[PDB]
From a paper:
We succeeded in crystallizing the complex of Cdc42GppNHp with FMNL1NCC (1–458, Δ172–198), the last canonical armadillo repeat of which ends at position 380. The complex was refined to 3.8 Å resolution, allowing information on the overall assembly of the four subunits and the formation of the coiled coil backbone. The interaction network including the specific interactions of the insert helix seen for the FMNL2–Cdc42 complex are similarly observed in the FMNL1–Cdc42 structure, which is reflected by an root mean square deviation value of 0.63 Å over the aligned amino acids. Surprisingly, the FMNL1 FH3 structure is directly continuing into a parallel coiled coil segment starting at position 384, which could be resolved up to position 422. The mostly hydrophobic dimer interface of the FH3 domain is essentially formed by two phenylalanines and one tyrosine as seen in the electron density map. These residues are located on the first helix α17 of the fifth armadillo repeat and supported by neighbouring residues. The typical knobs-into-holes packing of the coiled coil assembly starts with its first amino acid V384 and is continued in the classical abcdefg hepta-repeat scheme, with residues at position a and d forming key interactions of the coiled coil. Binding of Cdc42 to the FMNL1 dimer leads to formation of a convex surface that contains the membrane interaction motifs. FMNL1 assembles into a symmetrical homodimer by its coiled coil domain following directly the armadillo repeats of the FH3 domain.
The mammalian formin-like proteins constitute one family of DRFs, which include the large, multidomain proteins FMNL1, FMNL2 and FMNL3 (also known as FRL1 or formin-related gene in leucocytes, FRL3/FHOD2 and FRL2/FHOD3, respectively). The activity of some formins is regulated by an N- to C-terminal intramolecular interaction that renders the protein inactive, giving rise to the classification as Diaphanous-related formins (DRFs). In DRFs, the N-terminal regulatory domains comprise a GTPase-binding domain (GBD) followed by an FH3 domain that interacts with the C-terminal Diaphanous-autoregulatory domain (DAD). Here we uncover the structural basis of the specificity of FMNL1 and FMNL2 binding towards Cdc42, its membrane association, as well as the dimerization properties of the formin.
Residue numbers in the entry:
A (entry chain D), D (entry chain B): 1 to 178
B (entry chain C): 31 to 92, 110 to 165, 213 to 422
C (entry chain A): 31 to 92, 110 to 165, 211 to 422
């Protein structure tokens, strides 16, 4: 048989772990825990052939910068994640994450993934973000980035609303086989 | 599947530069999910040795681009310092390779195009592209994540003075990182005296009148980027009030007042940025006013003599009330 | 010896530039030894007009050594400025003769070899005149001009004037140095005069190529133990420059400015001398020194004795409540 | 009738007035009076002829610098004074006094006169001077000086113990007639 290794990288508290849990069990968790490393396994069907989908969850905080690349070996597709309402998390894509994975796992396709689309209309974030004179990333700005970073495609989703959530992993799997 | 695996785990754990905080938060794993870590560690391999980068970088120092891949080679050089095992760093910075040196040599090469705006120049103006030059600071920030390397940064003379020179770069993101960096070195023990010598150097090579005055221009006149102002304001607040001696505090405090800090901050207290307003108000609570402090000192001694006036008035009064009570 | 009312006496009493202090003692003289004075004034005549001295000095500004007899010309000018009727000074200093200027440019000329070892055609011609007394005599002339009320005012409004005097501290003679410091000390205490002295040392910083303000002041004061009377005027200049200030945040700025230059640890060694003027000047400075730490410790916290004073404030009231009730029991 | 005018100049509290009063009268004053200007006259006989000797006492304080030169005109001989126990008084001979008398009355002879010889050996004057790193003026150094300034002669004197006092004034009458 065959297996598809998928690693989710991204800034701390972007919602990597909820992204992985609101997908597999459709339960959106309440608890915030800084995730150290975790492994999930799900069998998925493509063209009547059983694939075992490997989901790897990594740490976002800078303390595990030395530990994180242990999840990297044998990766078929990467997920580079940021939140649409935190520009800090956005530009660490060009500064940290994309350069990190292209060092350790070159010639590995990856998707650009925006999370927390549901807060793009949230009132309390409207003022909080504008107060520091910045605004959330429009779909226009991110897909111009993915086009520069030689990313495969750009997808966005919310783990809470599950809107376009399944869509993320499926477009990701398609890139995994190339 | 070793039956007594504890020793291995520790050996391949402290080679990950983990804080005492995060290293036994982890020490309590299942025995199986501990072996799992030990075996990915040795299964992981380093693509390129530190000497490889030294060469390709040292050679960049001498029309069209052998500096073409400079931006990315430096960029994955940063990545290697940050995410490879700490052993890799020890080797990069050691005496045979002398990595910190050759690294510093290149930054100086790229940034003599930006320090001369406000020998043979040749290839420096093109290399002055903001992506080539700024990653270098990130390489240093990474070295300063490692304890032995951070002390190695403080006892190297030109290093810290060089970082201060990179404050001249026109990119707000770069400026803020420099200021964030200098802030850390400023508060570590004896590191305050190191930062001063760096800005003193900055005065002469830039040809300016007062010491940190090119900084004051940057802080005041740009209202575009907020987080720069945050890192900037925090650097200033540290350099003035982090000091041990309180005479030195008001000396340093006065020098900034002269640079029109207080008169600009009166207008900048108006911003509705939460992040800047908090750092500003923090500086404003810490200011000294030698005039006010002498006035409340007179007051003390004078209330001492009014407390002596109260101690004397109660004595005479109560003594006369008992003389009237006896005459009854 | 005609006896009118003697305010022909007033004219020669003014025109002698005497303090009001001394005019109180002198005006109440006998009548003969009062008119006797008046006619000595009218018999006394001035040898040379200021233009005579002006010309021969301006000519010195452009082998050479034809100036050799210059030193005496300066010495005879000083004598003229100090001891002649006050008008001679005004005539020297007015727009026509323009004395302060030509005088100042000559000092600048004699002094460009000593400010440099640290316009060249002269630079060579400067070293020989610098040996001479000329640099030190010239300063004595300014000392004379500044005791004259109107002339002293003309000096501070002159930009370069005081600024050249600050450079006059570099001359190799200890007595000359001391004169510069007493002088600059004096200009320092008049209203608004403080900033002019600092700006002079600011200019002094660059022209001498020195790191910090002063610091050259500090060296002459520090490394020379030869002359007693120099340090006295020196130490009191420092005592002035630091504690005379309006703003006390600026004062402690200045105290540190000198402290950093190693004043305080040197003064502990210099406190051993019992030269009376020096023992007084050092201790005079140490009594004025500030310690923000000290002011902060006794403004520690709470000021809780306020409510210990309130316990006292409540006590007098209550005691008085019993004494007025005693007037009622009476 | 002919007369010999003699003017006494020198720094304040050098002992000029005591020099003139302990000469004309044999009473030595202790009282300190700052003299503004004064006049004395004593008849002295030269070669059996009565000449009237004029003694003019002048101010030492720098306040009377503009007042003092009224006593100068028609001066036949000067007495320039310093104290042997005050070097301060000594160097004002060259920077202040001698050039002053030679401006107003050039080609008029003058004597160099040291006063207060009795304190050259007094302990409290030795110590007070030695504490400020100074030493009293030697007789060698005073005539070291005199020749250079073109003085007639150097004579020294003490008014307290009248001594070598008559000699000064004889040498003054001596320079007056040539
Ligand atoms: N509104 C909103 N909140 C979200 C979304 N996704 C995650 N969160 C929340 O954001 C917080 C962090 O999410 P989490 O999944 O733990 O982040 P992470 O990237 O795994 N962080 P780490 O790297 O530290 O393990 C959590 O409280 C979670 O509820 C989202 O789509 N919308
Ligand atoms: N030991 C000693 N003291 C003397 C001698 N002559 C004068 N004095 C003292 O020195 C002090 C000044 O003397 P005085 O005659 O007033 O000096 P002056 O030159 O007239 N001073 P002025 O110019 O101010 O009037 C006096 O206290 C006086 O007693 C002397 O020969 N020996
Ligand atoms: Mg996680
Ligand atoms: Mg007298």
């Amino acid at each position: 048989m065959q297996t598809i290794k998928c690693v989710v990288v991204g800034d701390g508290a972007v919602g990597k772990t909820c992204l992985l849990i609101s997908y597999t069990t459709n339960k959106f968790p309440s608890e915030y825990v800084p995730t150290v490393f975790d492994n999930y396994a799900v069998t998925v069907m493509i063209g009547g052939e059983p694939y075992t989908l490997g989901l790897f969850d990594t740490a976002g905080q800078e303390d595990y910068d030395r530990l994180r690349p242990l999840s990297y070996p044998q990766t078929d597709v990467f997920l580079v994640c940021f939140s649409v309402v935190s520009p800090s998390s956005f530009e660490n894509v060009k500064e940290k994450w994309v350069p990190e994975i292209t060092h350790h796992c070159p010639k590995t396709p990856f998707l650009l993934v925006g999370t927390q689309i549901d807060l793009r209309d949230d009132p309390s974030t409207i003022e909080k973000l504008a107060k520091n004179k910045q605004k959330p990333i429009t779909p226009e700005t991110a897909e111009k980035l993915a086009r520069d970073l030689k990313a495969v495609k750009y997808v966005e989703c919310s783990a809470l609303t599950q809107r376009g959530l399944k869509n993320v992993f499926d477009e990701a799997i398609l890139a995994a086989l190339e | 599947a070793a039956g007594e695996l504890e020793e291995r785990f520790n050996r391949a754990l402290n080679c990950m530069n983990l804080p005492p905080d995060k290293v036994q938060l982890l020490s309590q794993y299942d025995n199986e999910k501990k072996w799992e870590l030990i075996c990915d560690q040795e299964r992981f391999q380093v693509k390129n040795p530190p000497a490889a980068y030294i060469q390709k970088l040292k050679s960049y120092v001498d029309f069209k681009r052998r500096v073409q891949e400079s931006t990315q080679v430096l960029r994955e050089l940063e990545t290697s310092l940050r995410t490879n095992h700490i052993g890799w760093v020890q080797e990069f910075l050691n005496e045979e390779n002398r990595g910190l040196d050759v690294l510093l040599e290149y930054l100086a090469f790229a940034q003599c195009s930006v320090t001369y705006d406000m020998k043979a120049l040749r290839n420096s103006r093109i290399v002055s592209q903001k992506d080539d030059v700024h990653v270098c600071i990130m390489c240093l920030r990474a070295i300063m994540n490692y304890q032995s390397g951070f002390s190695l940064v403080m006892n190297h003379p030109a290093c810290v003075n060089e970082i201060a020179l990179s404050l001249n770069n026109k990119n707000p993101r770069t400026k803020a990182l420099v200021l964030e960096l200098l802030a850390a070195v400023c508060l570590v023990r004896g590191g305050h005296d190191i930062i001063l010598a760096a800005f003193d150097n900055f005065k002469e090579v830039c040809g300016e009148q007062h010491r940190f005055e090119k900084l004051m221009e940057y802080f005041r006149n740009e209202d575009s980027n907020i987080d720069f102002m945050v890192a900037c304001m925090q650097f200033i607040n540290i350099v003035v009030h982090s000091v041990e001696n309180m005479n030195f505090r008001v000396f340093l405090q006065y020098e900034f007042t002269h640079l029109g800090l207080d008169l600009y901050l009166e207008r900048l207290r108006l911003t509705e940025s939460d992040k800047l307003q908090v750092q500003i108000q923090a500086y404003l609570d810490n200011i000294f006013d030698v005039g006010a402090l002498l006035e409340d000192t007179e007051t003390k001694n004078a209330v001492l003599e009014h407390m002596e006036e109260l101690q004397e008035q109660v004595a005479l009064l109560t003594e006369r009330l008992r003389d009237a009570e006896n005459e009854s």
